Amino acid sequence: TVAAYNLTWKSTNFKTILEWEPKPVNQVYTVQISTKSGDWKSKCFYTTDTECDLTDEIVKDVKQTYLARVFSYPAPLYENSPEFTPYLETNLGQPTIQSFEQVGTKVNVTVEDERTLVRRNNTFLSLRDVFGKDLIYTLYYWKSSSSGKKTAKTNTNEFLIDVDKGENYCFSVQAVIPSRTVNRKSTDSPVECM
Amino acid sequence: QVHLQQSGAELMKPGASVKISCKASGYTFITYWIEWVKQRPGHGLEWIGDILPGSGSTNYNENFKGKATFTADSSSNTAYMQLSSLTSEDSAVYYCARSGYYGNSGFAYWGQGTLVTVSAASTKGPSVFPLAPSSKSTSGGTAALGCLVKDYFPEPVTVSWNSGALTSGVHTFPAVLQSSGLYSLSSVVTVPSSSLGTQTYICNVNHKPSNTKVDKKVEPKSC
Amino acid sequence: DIVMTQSPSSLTVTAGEKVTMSCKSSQSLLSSGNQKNYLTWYQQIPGQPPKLLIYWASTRESGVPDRFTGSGSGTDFTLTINSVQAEDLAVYYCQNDYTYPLTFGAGTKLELKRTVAAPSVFIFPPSDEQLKSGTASVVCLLNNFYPREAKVQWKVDNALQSGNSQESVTEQDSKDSTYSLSSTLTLSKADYEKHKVYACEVTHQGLSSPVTKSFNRGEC
């Protein structure tokens, strides 16, 4: 057999999947993840896949550090993953504009509160739920004709911006955790225009 | 369990600084904010700001900029606040607490605090004399007995009884400062009576600012 | 700044009643995005730092009993300690938990009323150990009583002394919810070694006639 290698955590909005190599020839894998202070819990058993969904484990506590290991068996050798702390490390997903509306000489732009895989009882917690005041949004607004790169920032889910009369603007939003070291920013939302 | 450990009680003179450490065990150090809170005797609570270890981010309360310094050593499980140009409005109790597990879920755990005392004042460990179990303090078939913790400086001090194997009915009075200027307090405890023969009671007093641990065996009278 | 004014500032109640206090942010802690009131609640009892009570205005934290109940939206809130326990004895603070800066309430002083309760009087002449270093300190102890108001009288040789004493009252108990007290008479070594009668007299609502525990200098 070959030991697994290049173990990576693929994660967005807490949806979390460990990946590795190689594509197995005459062998199988079993993944074990560790609470770090309990034990080695397997989540995948004797699979021919080179990935394991670990969402259900990390969403139990997203402010924990997780280790994983991948055992190799013939159709024994193992390898330790890098450390993964979900809260600090998981990628923010692409946001969606909920609504824009022309309130007087200003425009209101609302971002959807994105749902995550973190679960508490019977609620699937949202970005806002998990991150709270650590979460900020950025907006970009312009009419694609003269292209005026004007920026707005909000602590909530709503922007209140100044606009020119009769002018059709285009909008795109971004999710931002200023506090982070890595993956501070989501990808941009689909553009919405008047 | 999660445990925030604040560094011992301190005295500094109205001038230079003071480093205070919050050492956190019981969770992942980097993924929760640590919080700094001033509390004065009878003033409510005051938020200095916050810091996230592992990314070093900070938010200060604008009334302090110039005063507070948040830091944390990721790789030693300890957060730090330094305070400069110390004064009387700086003299207080200072608090480290952990952020919320569910996002905006307040402060969850708190450090036990640390008294900042700001004066050009002498240091002084106290005197500890026994308070005699006697008829003159025995009623209802129990005696009460303790110690006086006199002429120490500054606040605080702690007393425990028989290395805390005795937790119930203890009393400890907010030492006031003497005409001298040195604080002083007592700490008695009522107790089942007949025990006074075969049970040893001892007030485990500490004063860190002076660095004195003191033990006194409380003993009865003969009349 | 989101200012928080709590009210009533204080309030004092008997064990068993229901209490209500209000908390009011200067503007709204309502995240219309996901309909959450981003307010928080602390209890602070004697001798310990803030306990977290409730987050999101009305979510009860693990452990915290169901007899406390958070409620309100935007800029008007209400902790309701329904059927007060004696242990509930605290100062409670609401805390903005929404946007920076992080702010606080004034605080709400919950005190407990109860039956008239008679102080046990106790008295301790200095130890030989003190006499050594030539310090004269007499200590008076009233134990577990309601209310706080108490006149503590001193006589040396049946004549009235004061202000060589310094008074010191504890905070309320979190079980029997009583006060308890000391008053330290201090003098010189030779001052002490002069006189024989040393008295602690007491005045209190649970006292019809002023009680005394008295001793004689080196009675033992």
Side-chain angles (χ1 to χ4, degrees), chain A, chain B residues 2-220 222-223, chain C residues 1-218 220:
Chain A
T1 59
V2 203
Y5 65 96
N6 289 342
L7 274 78
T8 66
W9 299 89
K10 186 193 196 89
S11 179
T12 311
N13 291 354
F14 300 98
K15 196 186 168 194
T16 302
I17 304 151
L18 186 84
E19 283 182 342
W20 62 89
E21 300 192 60
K23 197 183 162 195
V25 181
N26 297 303
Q27 58 155 25
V28 285
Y29 304 111
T30 285
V31 167
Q32 295 224 260
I33 188 164
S34 98
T35 172
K36 176 159 280 281
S37 67
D39 60 333
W40 280 115
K41 201 209 175 177
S42 324
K43 273 306 280 190
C44 292
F45 291 87
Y46 305 112
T47 175
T48 36
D49 294 345
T50 61
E51 60 176 64
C52 182
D53 196 312
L54 302 171
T55 305
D56 54 3
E57 291 310 313
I58 73 95
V59 296
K60 293 182 163 154
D61 190 341
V62 297
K63 295 187 175 188
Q64 182 87 252
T65 297
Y66 294 88
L67 256 155
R69 38 151 76 144
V70 174
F71 281 93
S72 299
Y73 307 91
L77 306 176
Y78 69 96
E79 176 79 286
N80 278 197
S81 76
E83 282 193 347
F84 180 71
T85 304
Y87 188 86
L88 300 175
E89 293 180 60
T90 200
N91 290 114
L92 301 165
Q94 183 175 60
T96 306
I97 287 162
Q98 188 160 290
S99 69
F100 44 92
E101 197 192 11
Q102 228 263 171
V103 189
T105 33
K106 289 173 196 182
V107 178
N108 179 293
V109 187
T110 299
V111 185
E112 289 187 354
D113 190 11
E114 228 180 308
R115 256 178 48 211
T116 75
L117 288 92
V118 189
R119 192 183 176 150
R120 175 187 192 179
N121 298 289
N122 283 326
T123 55
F124 277 81
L125 276 73
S126 90
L127 244 42
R128 188 56 75 190
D129 299 340
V130 166
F131 291 109
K133 59 182 85 79
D134 293 5
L135 192 70
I136 270 168
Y137 292 95
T138 312
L139 169 69
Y140 289 110
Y141 64 100
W142 71 120
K143 309 203 240 81
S144 46
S145 53
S146 33
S147 290
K149 313 301 133 46
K150 300 178 70 221
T151 197
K153 292 162 180 179
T154 194
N155 295 154
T156 58
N157 286 7
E158 297 179 29
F159 296 94
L160 245 180
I161 53 155
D162 284 328
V163 291
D164 294 330
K165 270 265 195 281
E167 300 269 53
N168 289 162
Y169 284 81
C170 283
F171 306 107
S172 192
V173 297
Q174 218 159 35
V176 187
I177 320 261
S179 55
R180 265 172 185 199
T181 316
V182 302
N183 298 329
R184 308 229 296 270
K185 222 160 271 196
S186 85
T187 179
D188 304 312
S189 86
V191 188
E192 284 274 278
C193 313
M194 292 147 152
Chain B
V2 196
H3 182 84
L4 290 163
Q5 197 31 73
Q6 305 201 200
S7 52
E10 281 222 36
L11 167 57
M12 306 294 323
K13 291 192 167 169
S17 296
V18 50
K19 158 172 263 191
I20 335 155
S21 58
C22 186
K23 182 162 196 162
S25 54
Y27 67 130
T28 311
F29 192 66
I30 62 145
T31 355
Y32 281 91
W33 299 85
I34 334 277
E35 302 281 27
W36 293 108
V37 162
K38 183 200 267 170
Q39 167 162 46
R40 278 135 108 150
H43 292 272
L45 303 163
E46 229 208 310
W47 177 80
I48 314 151
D50 64 22
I51 181 172
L52 192 82
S55 80
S57 298
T58 56
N59 299 314
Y60 292 91
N61 185 302
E62 216 164 291
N63 310 282
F64 288 108
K65 174 65 212 171
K67 213 76 101 157
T69 317
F70 303 148
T71 42
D73 186 298
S74 307
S75 337
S76 76
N77 262 197
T78 321
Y80 289 93
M81 173 174 63
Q82 325 175 215
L83 279 187
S84 89
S85 308
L86 311 183
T87 51
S88 20
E89 293 64 24
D90 292 342
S91 313
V93 175
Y94 290 96
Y95 276 131
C96 85
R98 187 195 92 166
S99 55
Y101 173 85
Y102 277 118
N104 287 9
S105 54
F107 296 30
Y109 305 70
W110 294 71
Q112 86 269 6
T114 306
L115 187 54
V116 170
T117 27
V118 193
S119 176
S122 306
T123 317
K124 223 200 227 322
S127 253
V128 187
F129 322 105
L131 294 168
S134 175
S135 56
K136 332 271 191 162
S137 97
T138 297
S139 55
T142 54
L145 38 94
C147 321
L148 211 62
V149 167
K150 210 172 223 292
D151 308 336
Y152 77 90
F153 196 92
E155 300 268 63
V157 154
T158 49
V159 173
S160 40
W161 280 98
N162 318 6
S163 292
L166 156 54
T167 299
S168 191
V170 187
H171 309 284
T172 295
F173 306 78
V176 290
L177 297 92
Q178 304 162 162
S179 72
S180 64
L182 298 168
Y183 296 90
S184 168
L185 59 72
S186 25
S187 173
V188 287
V189 52
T190 49
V191 54
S193 66
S194 303
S195 66
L196 260 41
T198 37
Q199 180 57 213
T200 320
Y201 311 96
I202 332 94
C203 62
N204 310 133
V205 196
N206 180 17
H207 184 212
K208 272 164 268 160
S210 85
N211 247 2
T212 49
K213 283 207 291 299
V214 183
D215 299 330
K216 184 101 283 168
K217 270 186 198 173
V218 180
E219 265 157 28
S222 89
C223 331
Chain C
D1 258 46
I2 340 183
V3 206
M4 318 297 302
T5 29
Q6 301 198 193
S7 187
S9 154
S10 102
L11 89 171
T12 300
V13 294
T14 322
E17 328 243 43
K18 149 194 140 189
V19 307
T20 305
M21 75 209 75
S22 276
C23 180
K24 126 197 67 176
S25 70
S26 69
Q27 76 282 142
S28 174
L29 313 160
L30 195 34
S31 45
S32 68
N34 78 339
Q35 292 298 75
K36 293 241 191 185
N37 289 308
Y38 274 114
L39 189 278
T40 295
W41 287 92
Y42 299 104
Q43 182 191 64
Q44 200 186 35
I45 83 173
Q48 301 175 257
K51 196 170 223 170
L52 169 73
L53 252 197
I54 275 149
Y55 53 85
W56 313 334
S58 39
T59 320
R60 214 192 323 276
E61 165 70 307
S62 314
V64 167
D66 53 296
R67 58 218 177 54
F68 310 84
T69 314
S71 50
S73 151
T75 29
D76 181 59
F77 304 89
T78 293
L79 169 44
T80 303
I81 305 151
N82 218 331
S83 202
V84 205
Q85 288 275 270
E87 33 198 313
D88 301 345
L89 189 132
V91 166
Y92 296 70
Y93 304 76
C94 59
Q95 160 237 317
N96 149 50
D97 212 350
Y98 193 37
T99 61
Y100 287 114
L102 281 214
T103 64
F104 271 103
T108 292
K109 193 197 185 58
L110 190 92
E111 289 150 295
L112 268 85
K113 200 233 227 291
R114 53 155 289 173
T115 48
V116 274
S120 325
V121 191
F122 304 111
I123 189 170
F124 316 87
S127 160
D128 271 71
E129 312 200 39
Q130 194 185 336
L131 301 169
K132 201 212 174 184
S133 45
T135 316
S137 285
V138 196
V139 168
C140 205
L141 159 65
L142 292 53
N143 221 8
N144 315 176
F145 56 94
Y146 197 60
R148 170 210 227 273
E149 176 201 320
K151 165 158 274 167
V152 197
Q153 287 188 303
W154 276 111
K155 302 170 160 76
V156 176
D157 279 19
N158 215 108
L160 289 154
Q161 320 259 339
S162 189
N164 289 345
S165 101
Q166 299 152 105
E167 207 159 324
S168 194
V169 192
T170 55
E171 271 161 301
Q172 286 206 255
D173 185 281
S174 307
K175 170 156 285 183
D176 74 26
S177 302
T178 66
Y179 285 84
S180 313
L181 173 154
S182 61
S183 271
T184 305
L185 189 76
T186 308
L187 52 194
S188 88
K189 192 214 193 117
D191 227 323
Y192 178 82
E193 294 162 335
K194 267 228 149 165
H195 298 66
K196 193 134 78 97
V197 165
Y198 280 71
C200 211
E201 211 197 72
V202 204
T203 322
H204 194 87
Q205 255 179 289
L207 298 183
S208 32
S209 205
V211 65
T212 316
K213 291 273 188 68
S214 55
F215 93 107
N216 273 21
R217 187 180 62 95
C220 323

